[PDB]
């Protein structure tokens, strides 16, 4: 690289919330209405290189080898303004990013993408940010990204302002190394839906939103204690119920909506069948019909074969849970 050129490249992994983030207290800084708890996936990640050069006049984003539209371009530039303000400089960057996440299959990439960008900028500009400040910076891009700074179990503390809302990793005595998540890729419409817009309609008009608020802290504690004890059934039951409560809130929105399709319900049924046949596992769903199945690694295969009795081989994708957090790479 050139003499006056500052570059950094980072790899960050996606995460799935077991206790859901859903609805914001503050829409501009992305402060959430409640804490969330997630696990960071080994298989799925984003790699992002950022290159700061004084001769650059504006930010450029290249995604999987392709230019992005003026819209995405405008968005990334506003995000980099935050970075520039944080760093006290006026350098623009060329950003080259590669998603190793099944996005076509409906897996979200925003958590890994913003965590990767935050880390790469910190590396490029030698900002020396703490994990806490990295999380805070990622959060500004996407709420769930705040958690992808960390490996294993992580929790996003909601705080009350930009300084206090951020994530931290939970030590679980290496329990994360025993667990896995199976993704059931569900046939969906290819229409353009959005978590940010969905949770906003819900958080604002849901007749069942209060019900969600009145239970989430209890769920959070229950889950955290289940983790302290490596009690899989205890964790599973509460996260499965939390997730369903989240989708319940959408049904109460004005007017109602759902991310779930009949096939999501079919996969749910198979999970309950696996349990009754002494194969512990629990499901959760995000802003779409895909069903994610939490399972102890020893039972991963056995559970998968049950899904493989009905779903296409290509639609059953398993990932382990990675122990380590965001990393700087070449």
Ligand X SMILES: O=C(O)[C@@H]1CCCN1C(=O)COP(=O)(O)OP(=O)(O)O
Q: What does the binding site for ligand X look like in residue numbers (CB under 6 A)?
A: 17, 20-22, 30, 36, 108, 110, 142-144, 195-196, 286-287
Containing H/E element for 175?
none
Q: Would you call 139 exposed, middle or buried from its count of C-beta atoms within 10 A (0-12, 13-18, 19+)?
A: buried
- Please report how close the Cβ of residue 196 comes to ligand X at its closest, in angstroms: 3
CB within 8 Å of 20: residues ≥ 6 apart: 36, 216, 242, 243, 246
Query: Structure tokens of 185?
Result: 């890729």
Between residues 10 and 16, which has the closer beta carbon with respect to ligand X? 16
Closest by alpha carbon to 105, among 290, 247, 287?
Answer: 290
SS3 state at 184: strand
Cα–Cα distance, 49 to 61 (Å, whole number): 10
Minimum distance of ligand X from residue 175's CB (angstroms): 20
User: Which of 121/285 has CB closer to ligand X?
Assistant: 285
Q: Which two tokens stand for residue 202?
A: 């819900």
SS3 of 40, please?
Answer: strand
What is the dihedral sign for C-alpha 191, 192, 198, 199? positive
Minimum distance between the CB of residue 249 and ligand X, rounded to whole angstroms? 11
Question: Under 8 Å CB-to-CB from 102, ≥6 apart: which residues?
Answer: 44, 183, 185, 317
| Cβ 203 to ligand X shortest distance, Å | 11
The distance of closest approach from Cβ of residue 107 to ligand X in the complex, given in angstroms and rounded to an integer, is 11
CB of 282 to ligand X, least distance (A): 15
Of 11 and 20, CB closest to ligand X: 20
Q: How many residues does the chain have?
A: 330
Least Å distance, CB 65 to ligand X, is 23
Please identify, using beta-carbon distances, which residue of 116 and 287 lies nearer to ligand X.
287
User: How many whole angstroms separate alpha carbon 272 and alpha carbon 266?
Assistant: 10
Q: Closest CB to ligand X among 154 and 304?
A: 154
Nearer to ligand X by C-beta: 143 or 159? 143
Looking at the Cβ atoms of 6 and 141, the one nearer to ligand X is: 141
């Amino acid at each position: 690289t050139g003499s006056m050129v500052k570059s950094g490249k980072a790899r960050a992994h996606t995460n799935i919330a077991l206790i859901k983030y859903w609805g914001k207290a503050d829409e501009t800084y992305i402060i959430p209405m409640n804490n969330s708890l997630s696990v960071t996936l080994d298989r799925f990640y984003t790699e992002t290189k950022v290159t700061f050069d004084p001769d650059f006049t504006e930010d450029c984003l290249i995604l999987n080898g392709n230019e992005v539209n003026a819209k995405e371009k405008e968005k990334i530039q506003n995000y980099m303004n935050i970075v520039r303000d944080l760093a006290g400089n006026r350098l623009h960057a060329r950003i080259e990013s590669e998603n190793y996440v099944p996005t076509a299959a409906g897996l979200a990439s925003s958590a890994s993408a913003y965590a990767a960008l935050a880390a790469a900028c910190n590396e490029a500009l030698s900002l020396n940010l703490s994990d806490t400040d990295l999380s805070r910076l990622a959060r500004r891009g996407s709420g769930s990204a705040s958690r992808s700074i960390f490996g294993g179990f992580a929790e996003w503390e909601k705080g009350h302002d930009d300084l206090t809302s951020y994530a931290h990793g939970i030590n679980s005595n290496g329990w994360e190394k025993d667990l896995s998540m199976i993704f059931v890729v569900i046939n969906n419409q290819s229409k353009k839906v959005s978590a940010r817009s969905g949770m906003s309609l819900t958080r604002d008009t849901s007749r069942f939103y209060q019900y969600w608020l009145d239970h989430v802290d209890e769920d959070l504690n229950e889950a955290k204690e289940a983790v302290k004890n490596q009690d899989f059934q205890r964790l599973g039951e509460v996260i499965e119920a939390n997730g369903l409560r989240m989708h319940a809130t959408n049904l109460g929105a004005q007017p109602p909506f759902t991310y779930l399709v009949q096939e999501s319900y079919d996969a749910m049924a198979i999970v309950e069948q696996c349990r009754k046949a002494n194969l512990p596992c629990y499901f959760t769903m995000d802003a779409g019909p895909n069903v994610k199945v939490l399972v102890e690694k020893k039972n991963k295969q056995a559970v998968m074969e049950q899904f493989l009795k009905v779903f296409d081989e290509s639609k059953i994708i398993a990932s382990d849970i990675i122990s380590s957090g965001v990393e700087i790479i070449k």
